[PDB]
Amino acid sequence: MYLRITNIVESSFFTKFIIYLIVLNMVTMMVEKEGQSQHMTEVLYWINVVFIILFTIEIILRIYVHRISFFKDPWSLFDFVVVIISIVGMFLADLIETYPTLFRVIRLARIGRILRLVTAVPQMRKIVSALISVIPGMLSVIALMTLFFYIFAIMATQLFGERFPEWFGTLGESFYTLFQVMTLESWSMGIVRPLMEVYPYAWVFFIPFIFVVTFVMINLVVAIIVDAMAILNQKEEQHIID
Amino acid sequence: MYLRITNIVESSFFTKFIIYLIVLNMVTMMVEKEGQSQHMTEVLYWINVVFIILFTIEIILRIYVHRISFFKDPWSLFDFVVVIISIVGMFLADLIETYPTLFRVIRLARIGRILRLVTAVPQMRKIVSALISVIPGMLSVIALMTLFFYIFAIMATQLFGERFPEWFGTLGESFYTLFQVMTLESWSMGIVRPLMEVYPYAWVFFIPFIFVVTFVMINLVVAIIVDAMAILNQKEEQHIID
Amino acid sequence: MYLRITNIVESSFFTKFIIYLIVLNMVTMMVEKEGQSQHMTEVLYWINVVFIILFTIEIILRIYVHRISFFKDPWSLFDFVVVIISIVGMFLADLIETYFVSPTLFRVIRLARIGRILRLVTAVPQMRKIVSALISVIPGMLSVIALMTLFFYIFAIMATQLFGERFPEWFGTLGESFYTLFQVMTLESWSMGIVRPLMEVYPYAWVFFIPFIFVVTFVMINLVVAIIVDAMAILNQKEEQHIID
Amino acid sequence: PRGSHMYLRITNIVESSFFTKFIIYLIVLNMVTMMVEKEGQSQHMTEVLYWINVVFIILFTIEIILRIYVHRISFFKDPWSLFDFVVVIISIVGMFLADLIETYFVSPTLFRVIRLARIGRILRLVTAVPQMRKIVSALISVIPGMLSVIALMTLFFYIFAIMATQLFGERFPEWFGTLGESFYTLFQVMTLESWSMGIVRPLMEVYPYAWVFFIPFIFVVTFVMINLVVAIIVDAMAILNQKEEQHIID
Ligand SMILES: CCN1CC(n2nccc2-c2cc(C(F)(F)F)ccc2Oc2ccc(S(=O)(=O)Nc3ncns3)cc2C#N)C1
Numbered sequence A, B: 001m002y003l004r005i006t007n008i009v010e011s012s013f014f015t016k017f018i019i020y021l022i023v024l025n026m027v028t029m030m031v032e033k034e035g036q037s038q039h040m041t042e043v044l045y046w047i048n049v050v051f052i053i054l055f056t057i058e059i060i061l062r063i064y065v066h067r068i069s070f071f072k073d074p075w076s077l078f079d080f081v082v083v084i085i086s087i088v089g090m091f092l093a094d095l096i097e098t099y100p101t102l103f104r105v106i107r108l109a110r111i112g113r114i115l116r117l118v119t120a121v122p123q124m125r126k127i128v129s130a131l132i133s134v135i136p137g138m139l140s141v142i143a144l145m146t147l148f149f150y151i152f153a154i155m156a157t158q159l160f161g162e163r164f165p166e167w168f169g170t171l172g173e174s175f176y177t178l179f180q181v182m183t184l185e186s187w188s189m190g191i192v193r194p195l196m197e198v199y200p201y202a203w204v205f206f207i208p209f210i211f212v213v214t215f216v217m218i219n220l221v222v223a224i225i226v227d228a229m230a231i232l233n234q235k236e237e238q239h240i241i242d
Numbered sequence C: 001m002y003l004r005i006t007n008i009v010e011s012s013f014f015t016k017f018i019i020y021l022i023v024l025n026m027v028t029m030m031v032e033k034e035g036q037s038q039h040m041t042e043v044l045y046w047i048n049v050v051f052i053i054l055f056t057i058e059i060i061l062r063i064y065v066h067r068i069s070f071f072k073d074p075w076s077l078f079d080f081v082v083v084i085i086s087i088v089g090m091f092l093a094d095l096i097e098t099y100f101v102s103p104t105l106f107r108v109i110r111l112a113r114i115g116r117i118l119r120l121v122t123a124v125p126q127m128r129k130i131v132s133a134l135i136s137v138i139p140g141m142l143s144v145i146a147l148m149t150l151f152f153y154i155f156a157i158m159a160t161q162l163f164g165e166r167f168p169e170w171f172g173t174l175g176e177s178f179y180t181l182f183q184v185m186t187l188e189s190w191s192m193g194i195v196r197p198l199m200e201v202y203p204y205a206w207v208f209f210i211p212f213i214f215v216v217t218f219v220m221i222n223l224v225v226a227i228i229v230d231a232m233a234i235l236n237q238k239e240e241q242h243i244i245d
Numbered sequence D: 001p002r003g004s005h006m007y008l009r010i011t012n013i014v015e016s017s018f019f020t021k022f023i024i025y026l027i028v029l030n031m032v033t034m035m036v037e038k039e040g041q042s043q044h045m046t047e048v049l050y051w052i053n054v055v056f057i058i059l060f061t062i063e064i065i066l067r068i069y070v071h072r073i074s075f076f077k078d079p080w081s082l083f084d085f086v087v088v089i090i091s092i093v094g095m096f097l098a099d100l101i102e103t104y105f106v107s108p109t110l111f112r113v114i115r116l117a118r119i120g121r122i123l124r125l126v127t128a129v130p131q132m133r134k135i136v137s138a139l140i141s142v143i144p145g146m147l148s149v150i151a152l153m154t155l156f157f158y159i160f161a162i163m164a165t166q167l168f169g170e171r172f173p174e175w176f177g178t179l180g181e182s183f184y185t186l187f188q189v190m191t192l193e194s195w196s197m198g199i200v201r202p203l204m205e206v207y208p209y210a211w212v213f214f215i216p217f218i219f220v221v222t223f224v225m226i227n228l229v230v231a232i233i234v235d236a237m238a239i240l241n242q243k244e245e246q247h248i249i250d
């Protein structure tokens, strides 16, 4: 009896069917506009509840097989946190709408159901993991970039923030404009040149910020290149020996 | 008329002369403007018909020398699709002109004869396939980047698709702005800063979107290097034997 | 004598405690608002006074325990130059605040407070490592940086000549032309903002800016390739050493 | 008699440290005068600056005539020495040709173009000072390999440029009117400067499926570009793997 239910759960079909189910939930979410139709909203929402119930049947079948060993594997554990959030959230969203800004934000909880398309599917799972593994080597370079931003963010508010509060009022505004100056999005035409009307020697803060930022950025990417080449030459080196 | 032609087609004269015919068909396609002059349109359209005729003459000679073995080659197969699409397009466009916006959309079939420059030039052939061989390795990273775009796209409509339909109303409408924000083109001054007039904490969607997409970007570029470094080191590894 | 002090200053706890103060002084420098109110501005000013005192006390112990070693160490003198800057600044900014003179002189002079905070790139370890491993790169690309500046001159001497007459706001001065050519280099509004309105007056302006972008991008790409090949030289020239045995 | 004493004494002056370091000084000194010309600026300041430059023009002519008698046809075989002479003949022609257009006040627009000859004098700074000529030659040695990717990139621009003019040429002649116009706008779109907020979005009011031409263009160009930058790395790693190779042979 149970060996047939476990045969079906720990199956080549079952995985492919759950992948398919998530893919179709994504399609029922992809067909959402601003229009929309008071009817369409009632239509789409129910097809999602058709999914939420099937995805709770999905984890109930999968918790039946693993009993308490389900909590051990974080994959099984993630699928459970996604399922509880879909449920806790769909009822929270229905509740809010019945009695504003919160409704559209709270309605986000549905993303976990389709986010499982990086998790539940292998090949993708592999690329997500192999990419995440880069971050710790960068964590030092990342930390200095954050640390450098604080010095400049304290300076910007101090220096310009009086006449330019729209960009450098609080350290919050200051951090944002600097990141934008860093991404080089309208740094001059939009931010530095109008600053040079009030303060002609404003570039003395931004031109070096651009240089310092770009330098740290260049070294970060180069470190990933060289870290990939360090492990590549390591296997190449021992092969040569004999 | 099969004994002498078999050797003239597989000659330096025939391949160089046919490459010359393409260059001359590019120049005639270039000397087109918005102007234009109806006489200039009639003259240029006729110069093209001569080349469309000449390139048909070319493929007939190429078919009846290689007999059926012509169709084995995917390159000769392409050069054949080029002439049929050119001939079909020639009359398809003319039928519409004689009997407005569809006429422009159809007329780009003329590019087929000009696209042959990469495939026909035996060196341009090489640089193209050297770039093609890169893509299989990238396919993993792309698929993940595509899916991340979908999640961020479904979110953008749900969050800001209502009040800002010009950039986020539809899924595809949202997909476009996310690509514009990815290329970092006017992401802050033109999109995120005006979005924060309505939604003050909108930056907590776009800055985390920037990082997610840029990290994946860096890694793809880094991957193209490592993939090509396995080429330098492998021809060096076999050389280090003697 | 003084061995109990020699154990406090230059230890593990004391080393860590100074980081804690540097970090706590950053958080009070993070309370900078657009407002700000006569109360809050003076409140913040006084909190910093306390920190400046603590940091002067901090360098007093440091130079006493390592009497001759202070001058030999470069990082030990940085924390000293910062102390003498923080002290000079404190009263120099106060002098301009008391004697009501240009907020422009005050806002610029108050920028000495930053020294107390940029100590985090020094004082806390691994941060000193990263910043030093980054600074070590700067010479192994200094010729490319030098070539770039020279390339910028030649191009700025040209831009002021050609476009400077009808476009003074962007190219009227060599200082104006050094700015615009830098903006064009970062590709920010290069065409729409500068090269396109220039073509309204001088339609063959692109013949200068398209090659400028090219000449200036090639030098840039190679500067980054130089950082890679020099990093991959330390790896490659040690790889050979092991292979030899 | 010999007779050859002076032509072996003058080579000790021309092929020395002082001369070389002094000629590098003269170019730097000629740069600062060219640097101080701006917005406008009286005919006094303009004549003052013009005369300082004439002095500099003859100063480099004596320098090349010194090298002319010493190295002779051995200077001709050197490209850096040949170019130095080309600069001199340009800084002289230019000096007169610009003055001619100033005397007979016909074409004030052609004047600023011809007057650009003066840049040859300070253009020589990268080739004169060593280590700068080193890197210049090192960068110049990167472009030959790179050449085939560039040739492909150019071709991709020709096919995309004949396409842009064909489609959005009638309603938007401002950007894609002529073939040459399309080349510029597609380069702007490639460099990503206001590609959407400025060009692809307004184009979508008229032709709403216009992005189907630009998104692939932005992909294709960026794909060829990345591979070009990656090629520079592989062109550079050809040096490292070969020097290491012979060392391991023994
Ligand atoms: C005035 C309120 N009316 C709207 C709601 N309604 N209309 C159709 C279906 C539902 C609905 C029913 C249930 C039930 F009948 F089950 F009680 C639970 C939730 C329901 O509503 C939603 C269903 C799905 C989604 S979703 O597709 O966006 N998924 C989400 N996931 C996480 N947060 S929202 C959102 C809502 C809402 N509001 C009743």
Ligand SMILES: CCN1CC(n2nccc2-c2cc(C(F)(F)F)ccc2Oc2ccc(S(=O)(=O)Nc3ncns3)cc2C#N)C1
Residues within 6 Å of the ligand: B041, B042, B043, B044, B045, B046, B048, B049, B085, B086, B087, B088, B089, B090, B091, B093, B094, B095, B097, B098, B106, B107, B108, B109, B110, B111
């Ligand atoms: C105003 C109406 N005129 C269109 C036609 N005309 N005028 C000059 C040449 C031709 C023409 C002749 C033939 C025939 F000779 F067969 F009768 C076939 C097609 C013909 O028309 C074209 C010729 C070339 C091109 S092209 O240069 O754009 N090349 C193309 N390649 C692929 N698709 S279009 C387009 C058209 C059209 N329409 C009458």
Ligand SMILES: CCN1CC(n2nccc2-c2cc(C(F)(F)F)ccc2Oc2ccc(S(=O)(=O)Nc3ncns3)cc2C#N)C1
Residues within 6 Å of the ligand: C042, C043, C044, C045, C046, C048, C049, C085, C086, C087, C088, C089, C090, C091, C093, C094, C095, C097, C098, C109, C110, C111, C112, C113
């Ligand atoms: C209305 C005039 N008030 C300015 C001054 N004041 N208010 C509060 C504290 C102080 C102050 C006290 C001392 C004394 F302790 F002597 F009483 C010395 C200097 C003092 O002034 C400053 C102290 C710290 C900072 S800071 O926090 O910006 N840190 C800086 N570091 C370097 N340059 S500024 C700025 C000022 C000023 N002006 C009187």
Ligand SMILES: CCN1CC(n2nccc2-c2cc(C(F)(F)F)ccc2Oc2ccc(S(=O)(=O)Nc3ncns3)cc2C#N)C1
Residues within 6 Å of the ligand: D046, D047, D048, D049, D050, D051, D053, D054, D090, D091, D092, D093, D094, D095, D096, D098, D099, D100, D102, D103, D114, D115, D116, D117, D118, D119
């Ligand atoms: C009506 C003519 N006015 C210009 C002339 N003037 N004033 C000062 C120096 C000269 C001058 C003298 C000579 C002579 F001495 F021969 F008589 C030759 C050319 C001279 O003029 C120039 C000198 C230098 C430059 S430059 O600094 O731009 N250098 C250049 N280099 C290359 N092309 S221009 C431009 C001009 C002009 N016109 C008076």
